[PDB]
Ligand binder design. Structure first.
Ligand SMILES: O=C(Nc1c[nH]nc1-c1nc2ccccc2[nH]1)c1ccccc1
Length: 283
């Protein structure tokens, strides 16, 4: 678009590339996202116009939606750094737990907000979680999935062929990120759909009708699925204290219906002593 001067590519999103750009008129720096050709379906337009409404302190604000020359651009407020870069930058000493807890609390609030509006993210990952110098973290790419690649944070029901998943898939994704921040290593680093699923099974044990009633008749479930035993969280996420492990385990429940909500999670004892530390980031 003419009213923007790309400064650089800051990422390769799902539905198009993201650029840091400066508005030629206002002068403000922003994050410009180019979408994707039939001319941009109507349904897409409206889904996008709704996302322009749900504003929350923990959600990257969608400033303007530009549909020019049958092209689609989303203009989002610009954030200082993504969670991924900050995580890598903290691989030596690790993110202070008080900061980890603050980031989780905020993210859960964002999801809580989105879920109450029946809007799901569906593709949460360290790359689309954004942070700023003020101690804040926000969700980006929200609602775009519906409107319109790592498998590490994908919920088991999505891997098993379930077509009408719920908001609980986001809760699962967040739990995987929560653990990653704590251990400084990906929880389930799969490299193909079956490897992802089996990595989950190996750590949490293969699901059955007991822990997940109905799992055995899901579209892609195979009874030939190996039978792995469930590992203890003390081995999976040290040095996470008990309240943390207790919370993580509920975020990682197989049955999407037993999986903790963002709402309930915010009331978990893990957040009783939550503060809002400021990060030491290099821009
Ligand atoms: O939308 C994405 N990112 C952003 C929106 N506003 N500001 C940003 C942003 N991303 C950055 C990455 C590195 C350093 C600074 C950044 N500011 C987005 C969506 C999907 C994948 C990647 C980025």
């Amino acid at each position: 678009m003419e009213n923007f001067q790309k400064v650089e590519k800051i990422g390769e999103g799902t539905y198009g590339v993201v650029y840091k750009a400066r508005n030629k008129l206002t002068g403000e720096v922003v994050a410009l996202k180019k979408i994707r050709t039939e001319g941009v379906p109507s349904t897409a337009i409206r889904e996008i116009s709704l996302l322009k409404e749900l504003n929350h302190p923990n959600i990257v604000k969608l400033l303007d939606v530009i549909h020019t020359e049958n092209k689609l651009y989303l203009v989002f407020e610009f954030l200082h750094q993504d969670l991924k870069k900050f995580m890598d930058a903290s691989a030596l000493t690790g993110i202070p737990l008080p900061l980890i807890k603050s980031y989780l609390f905020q993210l859960l609030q964002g999801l809580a907000f989105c879920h109450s509006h029946r809007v799901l993210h569906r593709d949460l990952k360290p790359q689309n979680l954004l942070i700023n110098t003020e101690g804040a973290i926000k969700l980006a790419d929200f609602g775009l999935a519906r409107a319109f690649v790592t498998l590490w944070y994908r919920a088991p029901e999505i891997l098993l062929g379930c077509k009408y998943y719920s908001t609980a898939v986001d809760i699962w994704s967040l739990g995987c990120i929560f653990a990653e921040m704590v251990t400084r290593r990906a929880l389930f680093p799969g490299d193909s759909e079956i490897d992802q699923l089996f990595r989950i099974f190996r750590t949490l044990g293969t699901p059955d009708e007991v822990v997940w009633p109905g799992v055995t008749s899901m579209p892609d479930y195979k009874p030939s699925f190996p039978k792995w035993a469930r590992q203890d969280f003390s081995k999976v996420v040290p040095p996470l204290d008990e309240d943390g492990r207790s919370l993580l385990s509920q975020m990682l429940h197989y049955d999407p219906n037993k999986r903790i909500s963002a709402k309930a999670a915010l009331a978990h004892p893990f957040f009783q002593d939550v503060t809002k530390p400021v990060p030491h980031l290099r821009l």
